[PDB]
Amino acid sequence: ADLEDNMETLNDNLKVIEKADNAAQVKDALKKMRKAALDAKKATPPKLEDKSPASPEMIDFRVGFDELAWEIHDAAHLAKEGKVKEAQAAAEQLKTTCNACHQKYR
Amino acid sequence: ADLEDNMETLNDNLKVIEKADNAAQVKDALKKMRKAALDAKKATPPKLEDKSPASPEMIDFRVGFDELAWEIHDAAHLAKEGKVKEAQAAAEQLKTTCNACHQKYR
Amino acid sequence: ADLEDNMETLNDNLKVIEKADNAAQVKDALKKMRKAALDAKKATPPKLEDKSPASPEMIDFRVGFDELAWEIHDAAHLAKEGKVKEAQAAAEQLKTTCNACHQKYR
Ligand code: HEC
Ligand code: HEC
Ligand code: HEC
Ligand SMILES: [Cl-]
Ligand SMILES: [Cl-]
Ligand SMILES: [Cl-]
Ligand SMILES: [Cl-]
Ligand SMILES: [Cl-]
Ligand SMILES: [Co+2]
């Protein structure tokens, strides 16, 4: 998928998690987010398309999705145990990682 | 290890999972599969030896193993919970990631 | 963080795990080790400074931290279900991964 499609997936499912009632809804949304994070790692963002593909900034961009995926998995661990409120709070804290990348490459 | 050696490991241990009768067999097979997938990330496939190491195709190839590893971990979660049948069903779904990479790059 | 700071975070928190008494101490040390491992993926070791960031040595180096992060997570899985001693044993086994990278790129 496109980078923008994957960002829409991440943004939409974060809102699904915010409004969720039960753990299975949160689990499903976090799974879509993880798939979107890994697919986005394949993209070249507009900010960097004029730099070398081997540039340190492209590596910095890709590793950011490794960090996002691992943090999503931590929230998913809480959702699998049925801890809805804790999973929702951990999902909310993802936004620190979203924003950290946006400050550099948005 | 060799790219083909890592593929033999993935394939041998998928066959173990297909036939397994308990969660211990599955969990040990998935652990080997994850190690082979991560090690395969370090290789250049023959069909991409004519690409730069950070070309979009080589990124697609390497991230394909991150996707495989996360999907293996999903199956391993299920096996650690005694969901042997569900873990085996997750192993079957894994094959679409195997196939998609082979279609592009084998 | 720079690579040296990430390495001190790995070293320090491995020492906490060896000395820990309960699962909360082990879980929190493993979480910091994982964050440091992923942040280290973004760095260039001094022996590879003059190489392309996408050279095979640099890919080998970055995948080394994928393997370490996944091995850290296995230890966290053991600690999260309260198997403290098995988590401590697993954390001790990580050193073979630390040492393997060191022998090549330190
Ligand atoms: C880098 C490692 C990023 C992480 C982590 C996240 N995002 Fe992102 N985002 C990134 C870039 C380079 C861009 C610009 C390219 C583009 O798609 O526009 C974006 C953009 C968005 C957008 C707008 C998408 C669009 O319709 O154009 C959204 C809504 C967005 N990003 C949301 C988002 C969320 C919720 C994240 C964390 C869960 C997140 N992003 C992480 C780079 C990176
Ligand atoms: C890319 C991201 C791949 C994924 C995911 C999987 N495989 Fe693979 N495989 C890939 C390539 C580029 C090649 C060709 C290597 C070569 O030197 O020709 C292969 C090959 C195989 C083989 C045949 C090995 C041989 O001796 O020629 C097998 C049996 C195989 N792959 C199995 C396999 C399985 C079971 C996978 C998922 C569980 C899987 N592969 C994923 C690239 C990629
Ligand atoms: C590569 C994939 C590595 C893995 C895995 C681990 N380390 Fe590492 N380490 C690496 C390099 C290239 C270096 C040299 C850094 C430099 O700038 O010179 C290091 C260094 C250390 C150090 C010493 C730090 C210093 O004195 O500046 C320590 C204490 C250390 N590393 C610890 C450590 C541990 C405990 C690891 C596994 C849990 C580990 N490292 C993994 C590369 C890699
Ligand atoms: Cl997950
Ligand atoms: Cl990577
Ligand atoms: Cl696993
Ligand atoms: Cl890369
Ligand atoms: Cl972890
Ligand atoms: Co897990």
Side-chain angles (χ1 to χ4, degrees):
Chain A
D2 294 352
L3 181 60
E4 41 197 295
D5 284 355
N6 288 313
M7 290 300 145
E8 293 171 57
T9 295
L10 295 171
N11 182 237
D12 284 348
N13 276 287
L14 204 41
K15 282 136 61 92
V16 169
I17 288 157
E18 278 156 31
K19 292 147 111 212
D21 299 315
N22 56 63
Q25 296 172 331
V26 170
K27 194 282 321 181
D28 181 75
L30 288 167
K31 274 273 232 303
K32 299 169 176 168
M33 286 180 78
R34 192 190 76 207
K35 286 174 160 242
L38 294 170
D39 199 53
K41 202 182 164 192
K42 305 170 173 200
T44 301
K47 184 91 148 184
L48 305 180
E49 67 200 351
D50 287 320
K51 277 189 160 92
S52 170
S55 63
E57 291 106 316
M58 283 299 303
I59 292 138
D60 185 46
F61 171 83
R62 285 195 281 278
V63 173
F65 294 110
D66 294 326
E67 298 170 322
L68 186 64
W70 271 109
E71 284 160 23
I72 286 164
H73 189 57
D74 290 338
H77 266 245
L78 295 160
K80 283 154 172 40
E81 294 302 319
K83 307 184 188 179
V84 174
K85 266 73 165 89
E86 321 205 358
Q88 283 172 322
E92 265 295 330
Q93 213 51 228
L94 292 172
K95 288 187 216 215
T96 296
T97 300
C98 314
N99 166 77
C101 184
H102 292 159
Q103 286 182 357
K104 289 183 274 183
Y105 302 125
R106 176 60 179 81
Chain B
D2 213 340
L3 181 56
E4 299 189 33
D5 288 332
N6 288 325
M7 293 302 148
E8 178 185 12
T9 295
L10 289 172
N11 194 41
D12 285 347
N13 282 280
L14 190 62
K15 282 173 205 178
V16 165
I17 294 163
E18 279 176 314
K19 303 279 228 156
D21 287 298
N22 63 64
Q25 295 166 326
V26 173
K27 184 233 153 283
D28 282 16
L30 290 161
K31 186 83 152 254
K32 298 178 188 153
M33 293 182 69
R34 197 188 72 200
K35 287 317 97 175
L38 294 179
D39 195 59
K41 228 184 143 175
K42 300 149 168 167
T44 305
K47 270 57 194 326
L48 301 182
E49 279 168 3
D50 71 337
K51 297 290 205 241
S52 63
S55 66
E57 290 92 350
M58 280 300 297
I59 302 302
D60 190 33
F61 172 84
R62 284 199 287 272
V63 177
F65 292 111
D66 294 314
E67 285 158 336
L68 190 59
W70 277 108
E71 286 163 350
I72 284 164
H73 190 53
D74 284 347
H77 263 252
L78 289 161
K80 285 194 241 251
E81 293 175 349
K83 305 314 164 295
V84 182
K85 199 279 150 298
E86 277 149 276
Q88 281 172 313
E92 293 298 311
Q93 292 296 327
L94 281 202
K95 290 174 182 177
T96 69
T97 301
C98 313
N99 290 336
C101 190
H102 295 159
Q103 184 182 10
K104 295 182 283 198
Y105 303 124
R106 168 214 266 169
Chain C
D2 87 317
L3 183 60
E4 290 154 304
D5 286 341
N6 288 320
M7 289 306 148
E8 174 166 11
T9 298
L10 292 170
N11 199 236
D12 289 357
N13 276 285
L14 195 45
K15 282 165 172 192
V16 168
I17 292 161
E18 281 154 1
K19 306 191 226 162
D21 281 347
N22 54 68
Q25 300 174 303
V26 170
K27 283 151 69 183
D28 186 64
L30 287 169
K31 189 201 90 145
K32 297 167 186 171
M33 291 182 69
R34 197 192 73 210
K35 181 189 206 141
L38 295 171
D39 194 56
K41 290 185 79 171
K42 299 163 164 198
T44 312
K47 256 74 173 207
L48 303 178
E49 295 176 331
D50 288 334
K51 296 289 205 143
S52 163
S55 60
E57 291 71 45
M58 280 298 291
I59 289 148
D60 188 44
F61 167 88
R62 279 195 292 278
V63 171
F65 292 113
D66 292 322
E67 297 168 327
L68 185 74
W70 276 109
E71 291 172 5
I72 288 169
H73 189 58
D74 287 349
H77 262 248
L78 293 164
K80 258 192 109 83
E81 46 169 336
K83 304 190 201 137
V84 184
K85 294 303 159 221
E86 290 167 71
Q88 288 175 311
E92 200 67 11
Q93 282 310 286
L94 296 171
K95 300 212 261 231
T96 68
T97 293
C98 316
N99 287 335
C101 185
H102 288 169
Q103 294 322 312
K104 288 183 283 188
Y105 305 127
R106 189 167 132 189

